[PDB]
Design a protein around this ligand. Structure first.
Ligand SMILES: CC1=N[C@@H]2[C@@H](O)[C@@H](O)[C@@H](CO)O[C@@H]2S1
Ligand SMILES: [Br-]
Ligand SMILES: [Br-]
Length: 559
């Protein structure tokens, strides 16, 4: 029999196959009802052992999954001059995708590998095992077993999960991760809005909702994002347009009704309409296709100026009809609009002209856009600014409400992000930051972006994770394409943990008040928590959440 060693670890370790493992063992934790709780087990052999049999024994087995932590390439792990908090800076193989056990799991000579364990807890009232509804908590063991192909025992670890008998309350943070339907169609080689495409969209949206996405980017017309000037992405257009004469249109909303019904069925709460003017300037219209005498033709795009009377007349016809749709489906308090993403100060006049067209028709509706110039908000050009987390200080200082934030490739220094080359505490700490600063919404551009920069070519996300050496690996997507639907990354699992932390902090505030809650979160910090300053440390984050959980368990409750 070969030598075989194991180590039980938290969800916040990243186990590399080319390095010694310094992380300390973790064999206990706590959670609430409705929480997803995760851990992992690292293992190593001097020998090549193929097709390990890995099993768990627990009363929690109906709620438990086990997956293999796979390795992904990164050619651009970092931009120049990365800060000292980065875990690695070299190109190589990084732990990231989570694969089904049925795909096969191996021990590879003198390499630490990992399996990842997910426990998706129900409500107390749906829980199948016996449980004392009058106890403050109950602990359950989870035993994980490794055998070879022939049934010889190789290793084991025991984890003890304490479940506290309170429910993690429903998320009220607004959270959008931009959803690229085109990337689904080109990966799976299906036509846009075929029945095969709709089935895949549903699977991808269900994953998003399960990970705390409650606001979905909704493609009225092909979203004008990450597209070179004079280029295109695959047509994704929910609105049907018939051109009936020069500057004269008729509209049908049937595909939009299908999309909205899908959102309501799967648990999306807010409809975020796609941008109506081109990125980084608001200079042009999106690609728009229409039918003339049965035949499809492009009527708007990079050859139709945003300020031209042609696009103005089109929107004067379209937008009142979309408002009628919104009122007829009782969506009045459930919608957001976009003008144009990421304008600079040099683009303020064009952004204003575009905003003025929408404001003729969309009075009473929420309008937001990603942009970070406070000087740009002062002049009333944008209703809800969404500043980046490294530029948020002036928005906080001036009491802007509702407060939103985002991050992307530009947020490479100090702040929370989700790059391969950053630690899992640096990802998960966002939750605590959103709590302390009273943030109302979080936006990310990259649920499943699987093209290169400017959408010049299709890439394979299992081979190219940096959009062809443009964006640090991890920025453009959190899910990979499995055979029948999405595969999670460890980064996506850790992001959900941050959201859960925010929900736990808000519960402790309901029970004990904001002053005591903030005092607990900041206990023994050398410096105040900010978006740029925090302990990047596994023990700090785990012990802080354990303290929050203990305070909830011990609090005096009303019925
Ligand atoms: C809201 C955003 N808009 C941009 C996206 O379209 C991408 O280019 C991304 C790259 O990191 O950067 C920003 S994040
Ligand atoms: Br051996
Ligand atoms: Br929340």
């Amino acid at each position: 029999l070969p030598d075989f060693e194991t180590r039980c670890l938290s969800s916040l370790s990243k186990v590399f196959a080319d390095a010694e493992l310094h992380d300390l063992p973790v064999n206990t934790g706590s959670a609430m009802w409705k929480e997803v709780f995760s851990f992992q087990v690292a293992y190593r052999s001097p020998q090549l052992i193929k097709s390990l049999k890995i099993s768990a024994e627990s009363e929690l087995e109906p709620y438990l999954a086990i997956r293999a932590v796979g390795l992904s390439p990164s050619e651009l792990p970092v931009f120049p001059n990365p800060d000292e908090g980065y875990i690695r800076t070299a190109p190589g193989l990084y732990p990231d995708p989570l694969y089904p056990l049925a795909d096969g799991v191996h021990a590879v000579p003198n390499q630490w590998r990992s399996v990842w364990v997910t426990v998706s807890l129900p409500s107390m009232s749906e829980f199948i095992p016996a449980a004392d509804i009058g106890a403050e908590s109950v602990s359950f063991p989870i035993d994980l077993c490794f055998e070879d192909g022939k049934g010889n025992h190789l290793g084991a670890e025991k984890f003890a999960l304490e479940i506290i008998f309170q429910e993690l309350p429903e998320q009220t943070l607004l959270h959008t991760e931009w959803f690229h339907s085109d990337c689904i169609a080109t990966q799976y080689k299906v036509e846009v809005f075929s029945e095969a495409h709709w089935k895949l969209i549903e699977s991808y949206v269900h994953n998003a909702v399960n990970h705390g996405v409650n606001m979905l980017l909704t493609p009225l017309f092909t979203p004008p994002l990450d597209t070179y000037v004079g280029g295109e992405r695959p047509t994704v257009q929910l609105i049907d347009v018939e051109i009936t004469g020069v500057n004269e249109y008729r509209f049908k909303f049937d595909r939009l009704e299908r999309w909205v019904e899908m959102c309501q069925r799967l648990g999306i709460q807010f409809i975020e309409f796609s941008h109506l003017f081109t990125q980084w300037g608001a200079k042009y219209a999106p690609k728009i296709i229409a039918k003339k005498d049965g035949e499809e033709k492009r009527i708007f795009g990079w050859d139709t100026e945003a300020s031209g009377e042609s696009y103005s007349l089109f929107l004067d016809q379209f937008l009142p009809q979309l408002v009628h749709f919104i009122r007829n489906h009782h969506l009045d308090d459930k919608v957001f609009f976009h003008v144009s993403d990421e304008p600079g100060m040099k683009h303020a006049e064009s952004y204003r002209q575009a905003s003025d067209i929408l404001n003729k028709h969309l009075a009473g509706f929420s309008i937001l856009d990603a942009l970070s110039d406070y000087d740009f908000y002062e002049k009333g050009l944008v209703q809800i600014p969404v500043p980046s987390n490294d530029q948020i200080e002036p928005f906080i200082e001036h009491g802007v409400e509702p407060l939103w934030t985002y991050y992307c490739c530009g947020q490479d220094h100090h702040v929370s992000n989700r790059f391969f080359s950053l630690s899992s505490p640096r990802n998960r700490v966002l939750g605590a930051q959103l709590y302390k600063f009273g943030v109302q919404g979080f936006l990310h551009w990259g649920f499943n972006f699987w093209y290169s920069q400017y959408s010049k070519k299709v890439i394979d996300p299992f081979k190219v994770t940096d959009a062809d050496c443009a964006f640090p690996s991890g920025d453009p997507f959190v899910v990979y394409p499995g055979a029948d639907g999405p595969l999670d990354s460890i980064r996506w699992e850790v992001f959900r943990e941050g959201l859960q932390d925010l929900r736990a902090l808000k519960l402790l505030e309901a029970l004990a008040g904001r002053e005591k809650t903030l005092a607990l979160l900041e206990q023994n910090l050398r410096e105040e928590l900010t978006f740029k300053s925090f302990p990047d440390d596994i023990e700090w984050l785990l012990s802080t959440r354990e303290k929050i959980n203990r305070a909830i368990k011990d609090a005096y409750r009303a019925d």
